[PDB]
């Protein structure tokens, strides 16, 4: 039961890469109870395909369901959580599928290019609307960790703690490569129509293929060996699903189409791979030297997307700027998805991160 | 200047998965001089996108150019090398782009499904034609290593030495996943026309995307970080090439179209991921227990496609069947491509492998 507010109505959002957006709807949810001191507020930043709803109490499973709730690491008895769909998203916050106020048709190909710096400005405006003037913590994994990192730079005294799970401050060359293949799969779909597909058939073939590729970067080869190995589908096909792992990828690629928009996927992939914490500052050292928060950074050693090399490059850059840094690492079969799955290994890191330990 | 011979004319090749092929042209090349004892013959088996020409002496660069020649690891002063394009290929040996003798049009969608067991039967027939009744060695990397492995099983006393570089006897679940995405990229190209595209526009979009994905599995993230890092293209585009790594992938994907056929790519991907040395035998242990050759297996520890987990699973299976096994491993920035690039680390392994050391 997502909440909504229209912002940037009387003054547009000026985007880092140029051009502007007006009448930005922000979809968001809150959980728990803000205390009298108002000192227990936590911002949750979602990952690439996440949305405003990490948790439900009524029987549904949110994207962080088993990590969140009464007495759990994301403790709804303790904190007041705010979670919002990013600018450029497709689950309520203004994105390329939204109606362009200037045309009455979806933005589509006309949606401006956005970066994490824009996304966090929208989140700041939301918190201003909600009357939250300081945060106990900001927490996010993956693309959400980049949002948390950017918050730490842009609003250095606004939060006590930053909890960055499984992200680096720069995306690797190889990871850019995967994003590139995913974008090209979408854009070369015969129904893409340059991004203006909303009045016709959507680019389902390309988006489902892109999603399958993304999924192959999110866990580990060991996890897939355990789940499927070389099990075969009973009546498979050579040019379709023959192995069980192929069946699973095809099923999940198709299921993804029910919940995501191709243009949003393109815009957020580019925000992710373009992310540069130095943008708007003299250089990265100057940007990171702004950070005053207690900063927790967690590396999964088996992550195949944000690999240890990237996490260590980030660790070094943060240390070089004198960040109050607390770095932790461990292996997980779940690789990049571990921050969403491996509660046993993340529980203490999250609990301690939020609390200032 | 490839040589050609038509085989399986008076008796068709019966394929493992059913159905038959007649009038199979085999494109091949020989190098060096067969000695009077005829005991210096070596079969080279090419990898997924390789062909019959690993070497040229006239100025051109073959696919194994810097490893091969006078006094080099693949020593053309010492051995008589035979190299042939695989069944299902597109560089001279009968494949889906070849004319179907029964229709006068390319096989296309009518090309039968093939496996490594079929490919090696064609190679055996070629050697019979050439009057080679025993080999000093068989050598191949990647998909070529699978061909070498299969030779060792099917014709156990036909060769002294087997040199298997960077392949396992089974493809992993994750690796199957990548093949699946690559196949779907091709098949969902608007010009694929179910595989019968030869009279129209070829599926260039899908094939170039598939190739880009393949390339991201063939080296290492470190190698890409060294080559490109986050360097940008001077006048890039958001939905096209923005980073230098993207430019490179797009350029190489396009260049690949000049030399490869989409249907061949599909057929060989399936031969690779379906490869099962137990096929036609009671089980894998029975199959591998047939091997009598001195068997060299090399693992690149940084290989991101045939990962150490797979190479060790293979090592164990070969040992369990009492194979005369000689296993070596080392890291390389070039990962799966190291057997084609990293001469410094492969030179001794190849030299020793061929010679019976």
From Swiss-Prot, chains A, B:
Substrate binds at residues 211, 337. It catalyses: L-homoserine + acetyl-CoA = O-acetyl-L-homoserine + CoA. Transmembrane segments: none annotated. It comes from the Bacteria. It holds the Pfam family Abhydrolase_1. Pathway: Amino-acid biosynthesis; L-methionine biosynthesis via de novo pathway; O-acetyl-L-homoserine from L-homoserine: step 1/1. Residues 40-342 form the AB hydrolase-1 domain. GO terms for biological process: methionine biosynthetic process. SUPFAM superfamilies: alpha/beta-Hydrolases (SSF53474). It is found in: Cytoplasm. Keywords: Acyltransferase, Amino-acid biosynthesis, Cytoplasm, Methionine biosynthesis, Transferase. GO terms for molecular function: homoserine O-acetyltransferase activity. The active site is at 142 (nucleophile), 303, 336. Its EC number is 2.3.1.31. InterPro entries: AB_hydrolase_1 (IPR000073), AB_hydrolase_fold (IPR029058), HAT_MetX-like (IPR008220). HAMAP family: MetX_acyltransf. Transfers an acetyl group from acetyl-CoA to L-homoserine, forming acetyl-L-homoserine. Utilizes a ping-pong kinetic mechanism in which the acetyl group of acetyl-CoA is initially transferred to the enzyme to form an acetyl-enzyme intermediate before subsequent transfer to homoserine to form the final product, O-acetylhomoserine. Belongs to the AB hydrolase superfamily. MetX family. Homodimer. This is Homoserine O-acetyltransferase. It comes from Haemophilus influenzae (strain ATCC 51907 / DSM 11121 / KW20 / Rd).
């Amino acid at each position: 039961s997502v909440q909504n507010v229209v912002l940037f109505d009387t003054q547009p959002l000026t985007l880092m890469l140029g051009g502007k957006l007006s009448y930005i709807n922000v979809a968001y949810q809150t959980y728990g109870t803000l205390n009298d001191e108002k000192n227990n507020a936590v911002l949750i930043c979602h990952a690439l395909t996440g949305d405003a709803e990490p948790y439900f109490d009524d029987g549904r499973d949110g994207w962080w369901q088993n990590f969140m709730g009464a007495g759990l690491a994301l403790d709804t008895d303790r904190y007041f959580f705010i979670s919002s769909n990013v600018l450029g998203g497709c689950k309520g916050t203004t994105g390329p599928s939204s109606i362009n106020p200037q045309t009455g048709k979806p933005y589509g190909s006309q949606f401006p290019n956005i970066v994490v710096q824009d996304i966090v400005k929208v989140q700041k405006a939301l918190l201003e609307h909600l009357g939250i003037s300081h945060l106990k913590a900001i927490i996010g994994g993956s693309f959400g960790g980049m949002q948390a990192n950017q918050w730490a730079i842009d609003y250095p005294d606004f939060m006590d703690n930053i909890v960055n799970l499984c992200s680096s401050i720069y995306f690797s060359a190889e990871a850019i490569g995967f994003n590139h293949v995913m974008r090209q799969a979408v854009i070369n779909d015969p129904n893409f129509n340059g991004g203006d597909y909303y009045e016709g058939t959507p680019p389902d073939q390309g988006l489902s293929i892109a999603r399958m590729l993304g999924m192959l970067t999110y866990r580990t080869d060991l996890q897939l060996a355990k789940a499927f190995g070389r099990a075969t589908k009973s009546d498979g096909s050579f040019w379709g699903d023959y192995f069980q792992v192929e069946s699973y990828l095809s099923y999940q690629g198709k299921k993804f189409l029910e919940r995501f928009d191709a243009n949003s996927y393109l815009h957020l992939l580019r925000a992710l791979d373009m992310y540069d914490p130095s943008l708007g500052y003299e250089n990265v050292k100057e940007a990171l030297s702004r950070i005053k928060a207690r900063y927790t950074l967690v590396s999964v050693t088996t992550d195949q997307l944000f690999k240890p090399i990237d996490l260590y490059k980030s660790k070094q850059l943060l240390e070089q700027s004198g960040v109050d840094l607390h770095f932790y690492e461990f292996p997980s079969d779940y690789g990049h998805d571990a921050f969403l799955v491996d509660y046993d290994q993340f529980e203490k890191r999250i609990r301690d991160g939020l609390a200032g330990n």
